[PDB]
Design a protein around this ligand. Structure first.
Ligand SMILES: CC(C)(COP(=O)(O)OP(=O)(O)OC[C@H]1O[C@@H](n2cnc3c(N)ncnc32)[C@H](O)[C@@H]1O)[C@@H](O)C(=O)NCCC(=O)NCCS
Ligand SMILES: CC(C)(COP(=O)(O)OP(=O)(O)OC[C@H]1O[C@@H](n2cnc3c(N)ncnc32)[C@H](O)[C@@H]1O)[C@@H](O)C(=O)NCCC(=O)NCCS
Ligand SMILES: CC(C)(COP(=O)(O)OP(=O)(O)OC[C@H]1O[C@@H](n2cnc3c(N)ncnc32)[C@H](O)[C@@H]1O)[C@@H](O)C(=O)NCCC(=O)NCCS
Ligand SMILES: CC(C)(COP(=O)(O)OP(=O)(O)OC[C@H]1O[C@@H](n2cnc3c(N)ncnc32)[C@H](O)[C@@H]1O)[C@@H](O)C(=O)NCCC(=O)NCCS
Ligand SMILES: CC(C)(COP(=O)(O)OP(=O)(O)OC[C@H]1O[C@@H](n2cnc3c(N)ncnc32)[C@H](O)[C@@H]1O)[C@@H](O)C(=O)NCCC(=O)NCCS
Ligand SMILES: CC(C)(COP(=O)(O)OP(=O)(O)OC[C@H]1O[C@@H](n2cnc3c(N)ncnc32)[C@H](O)[C@@H]1O)[C@@H](O)C(=O)NCCC(=O)NCCS
Lengths: 157, 160, 158, 158, 160, 157
């Protein structure tokens, strides 16, 4: 049985993230989406809220489940008997950031990382920029799953 | 069950490539290394020579095999009943180049591409630069599989 | 008064990515001239007259655009027509560096300025070179090119 | 008819690099509006009114430019004024990626287009943040800022 | 005769930094490592702690010494009668960041900057990521000098 | 005695190259400019012509001399009892290219490389683009030393 973890902040999950999940789920026997706090935010949504938004958006991926993670990512991965991380890349900035972490994670624990390329339609999509646009009344409905849009309006209103 | 294709010129295969193969083979049930011609490159070794060197260098990888293809990469992949490509990345230029092909390949055939980061030790290794260094007598023995190194140096001494 | 810009390139052949740039230029400048020029570091497929023809077919619905060719410096092409602006599109970091260098050189030697626009997300991976390669090996690039160009591309290949 | 573009930014403070962009925008658009906006991910030094004042002092010789502020989405600022174009400057690959993302987002949510221009080579290393840092520790940034701004910068620091 | 300054936050010094120091010291008659505060970073160790760790880690470098500075880097450099800065580069982002400062520093004071490429083995090493990994119990012992590693882990266990 | 080699095609030398030479000569006791053929050109100028253009443009750098090089760069460097290469960087493209060669050269021979940043004024300057602009009558006189401009016109006319 093959398996991978898809870690992130997912604050909130976007259609770009979902595209990664779908492609990971198509190639691995099990996918665990791990919701972690990134060391330099506090977030708009609680971990539990993030988890629910992901679960509601991934119901059609039967081999995917969602979990909170704390502490070191490579510990999370190894504790669940896996040895693969799946991340996504939009930009050269993503590439540099992710390459550093991938090499570090492999060095400290032997855990490998696979990257998927963004869909062209979602290349400019990030949680941070979506939240900013929405905060000032901009329409980001085409960039997010339905399970996020209402929650996002609620948190802003 | 799960499977991936690792395509490339592999002209010749380096320890950088082999590292990618090993990591792909450790995650997927079967891996097929696909030796293809890059339309935009001059080559040194024939496809058959490239296949020989990879087969020679991948003996410890039981679930991997090596084949060639004459057309579109996505046709090679789908004809073997697979839908995943695995490619390695060293540099930002690799990233842009590979992102473009990944999106093109997904657009025309629905085939997905997964990237892996180079091993830090092999980040500066390419077939082109290894060939160039060896052409002028530099020591690339730590960058290539043993059999590749012998065949490369022999080839160069024949001056072809 | 009326403003104007030149959209130069190899356009070998013109793609939906190029066309997106032309449309956006024509929306913001009173006058746009698409300039077909030879890149001295490229081996071309179509002739200049073929390239011009394909662009003209594909830009019928842009009333303030015309298509021309030139055989020397881009900046001479621009100034000869009483203009001082170039518009280019960017997909990648590599495009950015390449275009930045030319933009600064062109400003230095002639005082002509250059404006860049970002690719449409849907056309980020589209290039003339790759569409030609994919088409050569039977791949379907119909969603990446004008039907006009798709036909002329498939025509010569097959 | 007349064309128009908005040149938005933090401008905290405006530098010779920004001014170069304004001049080039004003040369190619009939109307330019410099928009002082808050970046929600930045801690600002000068007030909006101070920023506006420094830009106005520095752009006296550009007759077709005015300076305004906004408190919401850039694309609302642009459309409210009957415009559909943004002009931004690029120094680095990091600028390119950042601006590309915003340009595609802004086009997506409002249909507003963005044009980029390359930095003047002499101002490639100039940023508001670094000029402020260098000035704070006594360094001479006089060749990087308008004398107006240099004075107001040195003023608050000393 | 010839000399260069190697400036940085060095919070804490890593084997990546030390590699730069060694290569600078092998080319210039004297090297001064300058521990400076980066105005745009939160720090973990005091400047004095940083100096101690570097001094501890550079014993095999006879022509190198370590000092601190409170103002402009270019003032630190020129006050010691030097005119060269040496910095290392791992990534394209390092390059853009360092190019900007190099041009600024040459503009305001005429001081030159020389860059060196990271050792491939340490390309992914940064103080920030090493601190983060150690904060969560990961093994960064191969990335840091022995004394640094002890002081870092001790510091973290005190949870400061 | 410290020393470095400044290798390149220099076809022709530009004011950007000269800026590198000047900064190298200010920090090293001796600088050797090495004119090599880059494996993928044939060049506009002969090696001897390139050498003369450099010598004429560097007369004011008394600790700099100019030489042709053949074969492996790190052999050239070590044969002259040096262990340092000095290159220049304009762009991210330069950085990637040069970083690869610097790591390769250090790996195969232990020779180190130091890079200098371009002067802002010359960042867009390359031999290739200068030659192209000149070929179509463009004025590149502000980008090249005087010892190059006449030779360049002569080679084009
Ligand atoms: C939580 C981690 C993974 C950081 O996550 P991050 O905040 O970056 O996640 P974020 O939600 O922003 O993004 C998640 C992933 O989705 C990708 N992505 C986002 N949008 C898109 C898109 N449109 N298309 C494709 N991919 C996308 C991102 O590039 C990223 O890879 C990291 O902080 C971590 O591992 N923390 C645990 C502690 C640890 O182990 N530290 C050591 C690291 S070496
Ligand atoms: C043959 C193809 C894949 C090009 O291969 P390419 O020449 O780039 O392969 P090359 O041998 O150079 O490299 C192979 C792969 O190994 C990676 N790699 C190289 N060195 C290393 C290293 N040290 N570490 C990790 N990865 C590495 C490369 O980044 C690349 O991903 C391409 O031309 C192709 O697909 N041709 C078929 C026609 C086709 O389908 N065309 C349409 C493409 S959209
Ligand atoms: C012909 C010139 C402009 C080069 O053109 P080039 O070959 O690069 O054109 P090409 O057709 O490939 O692309 C044209 C433009 O479209 C852009 N583009 C391509 N695809 C896309 C897309 N999908 N989306 C947006 N933009 C795109 C390109 O980035 C480029 O800006 C250049 O060679 C030139 O100016 N030649 C004349 C001689 C001269 O003046 N030389 C001195 C130059 S400083
Ligand atoms: C205010 C905005 C535009 C950000 O501006 P920013 O802080 O980046 O401005 P800053 O003053 O730093 O720079 C302004 C512009 O000048 C350019 N520039 C700076 N220096 C130079 C130079 N030397 N040469 C050329 N250009 C330069 C910058 O690259 C940038 O394009 C952005 O935060 C915004 O739009 N805010 C409004 C809210 C909104 O709409 N959010 C959604 C965005 S998708
Ligand atoms: C302190 C300065 C230099 C910033 O240092 P910084 O925080 O970036 O240092 P840091 O420790 O992070 O890194 C130091 C150097 O080591 C390099 N480096 C890091 N890791 C590695 C590695 N593995 N290999 C090679 N090099 C490396 C970095 O790229 C950097 O060049 C800067 O803030 C400064 O000059 N401050 C003084 C005030 C001043 O003069 N300001 C004006 C500057 S224009
Ligand atoms: C000859 C070499 C160095 C390549 O030289 P190249 O053709 O790149 O030189 P070129 O003349 O183009 O440039 C010379 C240097 O000047 C720099 N430069 C150019 N313009 C500028 C500028 N305006 N500002 C700063 N630096 C500049 C370049 O970035 C480059 O570093 C290389 O091919 C080589 O080493 N060949 C020998 C064989 C060998 O050893 N091969 C193995 C290499 S690992």
């Amino acid at each position: 049985m093959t398996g991978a973890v898809c870690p992130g902040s997912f604050d909130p999950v976007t259609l770009g993230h979902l595209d990664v999940f779908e492609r990971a789920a198509a190639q691995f026997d099990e996918v665990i989406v791990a919701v972690l706090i990134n060391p330099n935010k506090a977030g708009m949504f609680t971990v539990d809220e993030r988890i629910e938004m992901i679960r509601e958006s991934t119901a059609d991926l039967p081999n995917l489940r969602v979990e909170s993670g704390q502490g070191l990512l490579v510990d999370f991965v190894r504790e669940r008997g896996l040895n693969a991380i799946v991340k996504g890349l939009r930009t050269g900035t993503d590439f540099e950031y992710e390459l550093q972490m991938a090499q570090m994670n492999k060095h400290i624990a032997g855990v490998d990382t696979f990257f998927v390329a963004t869909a062209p339609a979602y290349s400019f999509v990030s949680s941070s920029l979506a939240k900013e646009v929405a905060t000032y009344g901009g329409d980001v409905s085409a960039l997010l799953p339905a399970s996020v849009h209402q929650r996002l309006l609620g948190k802003l209103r």
